[PDB]
Amino acid sequence: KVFGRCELAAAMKRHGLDNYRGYSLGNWVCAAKFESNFNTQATNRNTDGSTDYGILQINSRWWCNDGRTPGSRNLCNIPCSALLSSDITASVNCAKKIVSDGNGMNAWVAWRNRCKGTDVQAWIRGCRL
Numbered sequence: 001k002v003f004g005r006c007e008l009a010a011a012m013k014r015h016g017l018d019n020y021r022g023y024s025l026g027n028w029v030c031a032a033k034f035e036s037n038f039n040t041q042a043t044n045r046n047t048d049g050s051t052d053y054g055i056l057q058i059n060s061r062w063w064c065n066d067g068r069t070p071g072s073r074n075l076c077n078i079p080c081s082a083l084l085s086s087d088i089t090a091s092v093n094c095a096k097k098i099v100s101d102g103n104g105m106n107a108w109v110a111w112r113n114r115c116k117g118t119d120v121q122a123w124i125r126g127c128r129l
């Protein structure tokens with residue numbers, strides 16, 4: 001599913017990401033924009049053999065099981081395929097654990113490089129939320 005900008009903001013708020021760990025909704029929408037272009041089916045293979053899945057491009061090295069990342073963990077206790085669903089619940093629940101792991105949203109390199117220190121509120125501006 002490719003979400004609209006305001007549609008995704010509302011779904012993220014629905015699932016309790018707005019201001020989760022102090023990160024306003026616009027940070028999460030901006031991260032999703034640059035990780036996946038709002039596409040829940042996004043996947044991207046990394047040089048280490050791990051794969052990133054879903055609208056927040058959650059990586060199989062630590063967070064989900066895909067059966068093909070040797071030595072990896074599954075800290076969200078989910079198959080990586082669950083992160084590709086049109087329902088964002090699994091991606092949100094896993095993102096909450098990632099963002100709580102010590103480095104905040106810096107865990108998403110694209111957030112650090114493309115959202116951090118910008119006017120992230122622009123990503124939710126105009127939306128009925």
Ligand SMILES: [Cl-]
Nearest residue numbers: 024025026121
């Ligand atoms: Cl915001």
Ligand SMILES: [Cl-]
Nearest residue numbers: 067068069070
């Ligand atoms: Cl594996």
Ligand SMILES: [Cl-]
Nearest residue numbers: 011086087088
């Ligand atoms: Cl949803």
Ligand SMILES: [Cl-]
Nearest residue numbers: 021103104105
């Ligand atoms: Cl933080």
Ligand code: NA
Nearest residue numbers: 060064072073
């Ligand atoms: Na894994």
